[PDB]
Amino acid sequence: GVLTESNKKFLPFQQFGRDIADTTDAVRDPQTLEILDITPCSFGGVSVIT
Amino acid sequence: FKIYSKHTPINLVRDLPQGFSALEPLVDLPIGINITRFQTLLAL
Ligand SMILES: *[C@@H]1O[C@H](CO)[C@@H](O)[C@H](O)[C@H]1NC(C)=O
Q: CA A41, CA A37: separation in Å to the nearest integer?
A: 12
**Residue A29 Cα to chain centre, angstroms:** 12
Write out the E strands in chain A.
2-5, 16-18, 24-28, 35-39
Structure-determination technique: cryo-EM
Beta carbons of B1 and B29 less than 8 angstroms apart: yes
Alpha helices in chain B, H assignment, sequence order = none
**Amino acid at residue number B41:** L
Beta carbons of B19 and B12 less than 8 angstroms apart: no
Please list every residue in chain A whose beta carbon sits closer than 8 Å to the beta carbon of residue B24: 11-12
Q: Does A9 touch chain B (CB under 8 A)?
A: no
Beta carbons of B2 and B25 less than 8 angstroms apart: yes
